[PDB]
Amino acid sequence: MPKDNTWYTGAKLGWSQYSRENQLGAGAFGGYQVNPYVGFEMGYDWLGRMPRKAQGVQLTAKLGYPKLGTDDLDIYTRLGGMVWRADTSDKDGNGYISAAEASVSPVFAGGVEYVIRRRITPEIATRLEYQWTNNASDNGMLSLGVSYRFGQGEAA
């Protein structure tokens, strides 16, 4: 039932390798699962700390594969980009100034999910995702949380 053109609404927190800057990966992850193969995942992290709307959003395509989860486990691999602000504001006096467009970042993550075999299994999936950028031992984020199927109270 929670499969094929179904909604993915979840909340998760991540920590990153050598995070010098005061940032915690408190992300709300929303999207859609069209097939038992591929779906779409977006991660919205808002830094509601500074008096500026620091909106750090990732857009990833996920491959949701069973991988012979011999009790209760499935793997999702998500590839795409994480962009903050999209186009920031400042207004450099007046005249002909180019648009302050923020850059796409090639990010790929390998996450594993379990569904709660207890009080209401079609509720939340416990997920642990490992978010990597570039090649070799580069920079990793460890993101963990729970995702709810559909989410009837669609918090926009």
UniProtKB/Swiss-Prot annotation:
Membrane-traversing stretches: 6-16, 23-34, 38-46, 55-66, 73-81, 106-115, 124-132, 141-150
Protein name: Outer membrane protein A
Assembly description: Monomer. Homodimer. Interacts with Lpp. About 10% of the C-terminal periplasmic domain dimerizes when expressed without the N-terminal domain. Interacts with F plasmid-encoded TraN during conjugation.
Description of post-translational modifications: Hydroxybutyrylation on Ser-143 and/or Ser-147 can add up to 10 R-3-hydroxybutyrate residues; it is not clear if one or both residues are modified in vivo. Hydrophobic residues adjacent to the modified Ser residues (i.e. Leu-142, Leu-144 and Val-146) are important for hydroxylation. Hydroxybutyrylation occurs in the cytoplasm. Hydroxybutyrylation is required for stable pore formation, unmodified protein may not be able to insert into the outer membrane. Further hydroxybutyrylation occurs in the C-terminal fragment (residues 285-346); this modification probably occurs in the periplasm.
Known outcome of mutating R127C: Modifies gate residues, no activity in oxidizing conditions, in reducing conditions activity channel opens frequently, probably forms a disulfide cross-link in channel, grows very poorly in the absence of NaCl, addition of reducing agent (0.05% beta-mercaptoethanol) improves growth
Residues annotated as site: Part of salt bridge gating mechanism: E41, R127
Effect noted on mutating E41C: Modifies gate residues, no activity in oxidizing conditions, in reducing conditions activity channel opens frequently, probably forms a disulfide cross-link in channel, grows very poorly in the absence of NaCl, reducing agent (0.05% beta-mercaptoethanol) improves growth
Top-level taxon of origin: Bacteria
Consequence of gene loss (knockout): Double lpp-ompA mutants are spherical and only grow in the presence of electrolytes such as 30 mM Mg(2+), and are sensitive to hydrophobic antibiotics and detergents. The peptidoglycan layer is no longer attached to the cell outer membrane which undergoes abundant blebbing. Decreased efficiency of bacterial conjugation of the F plasmid. Deletions grow poorly on SDS, cholate, at pH 3.8 or at 5 M NaCl. Grows very slowly in the absence of NaCl, wild-type growth in 1% NaCl. E.coli is no longer killed by human neutrophil elastase (ELANE) in vitro.
